[PDB]
Every structure is written in C-alpha cells, then in structure tokens.
Amino acid sequence: WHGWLSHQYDDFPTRTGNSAFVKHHYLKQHTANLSNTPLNHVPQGAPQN
C-alpha cells in the first residue's frame, strides 16, 4: 500500500484474489522503523554486537 498511497500506481494489494503483486516464498512481513529499539540494525563487529 506504500506505492498506492504514493500514487506510483493505481493497483492495490488484494487478499485472497487475483493480485498485481508477486508473492514469493522468501518474502518477510513488513516492519515499521525499528530504530531506537533493541531490534535495530547492529553492524557486524560493532561494540553493541
């Protein structure tokens, strides 16, 4: 729905029906900005890691 709101295209996701978006087996559920949270991006070798 990000693109639909941004008006990039007029297609929107449709649950349980002919969709305009590919659904691969390796996809992961969308997550909001996880910064300022313990589940944030920690570079490998960083002191936090």
Partner: protein
Amino acid sequence: LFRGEHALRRYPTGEERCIACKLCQSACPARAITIETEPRPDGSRRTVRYDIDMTKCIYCGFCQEACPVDAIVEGPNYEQTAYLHEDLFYDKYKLLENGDKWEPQIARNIEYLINQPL
C-alpha cells in the same frame, strides 16, 4: 523511478541475483559501496561482504543503473530515519532483509520500467 533505500533482490527461486562484478562499486560516485567476494562452496560467484554507507552515499541511482542483473535496487522506502550513526551502515543482512520485505512494490515498479521500452 523514485530512488529511496538500497536493497538487494533475489530470483523467484530464492537465489541471490547479485554477482560480484563490482560495477556498482566502481560507478558509485561517493565510494559508498564496499564489496568483498569469495567463491561459494557450491562454486557460485557470490559476495561475502556487501556494505553500503547510507551516510556517505548520494541517492543518485547509479548503482541500480549499472547493475546488470538488477540485484541492487533503490526501492521506494524513504522513512529510514536512524537515531544511531551505526544503524546507517547498511550491511548485506540489512540489504537482503529490505529486499525481501519490499520485493512486491519493487517488482511492480520494475515490471512497468521494463515494459516501457517495449
């Protein structure tokens, strides 16, 4: 055509589309891409370290333009505000996670982009 957050895509089979040709690294005007590659045990030509410094990178799109297999794509995500400078040192893990999450919209845009020349 909007260039947001760098991400790494995969083939529909799940294999990495990125091959260590370093064209994106060479084209990166800001030298924001660091790539180190070693042969995979199966023998594939795949990178072992692919880092993008989001703070050092200018969101130009030369990486995606120079990618010959559409591995690196600047997806539409722009709400990537970070509180710690280390959080902006995007790694291969971060890029692959972003690509997995944003594959639908990225693929939808790529369809139209590829069909435009036709």
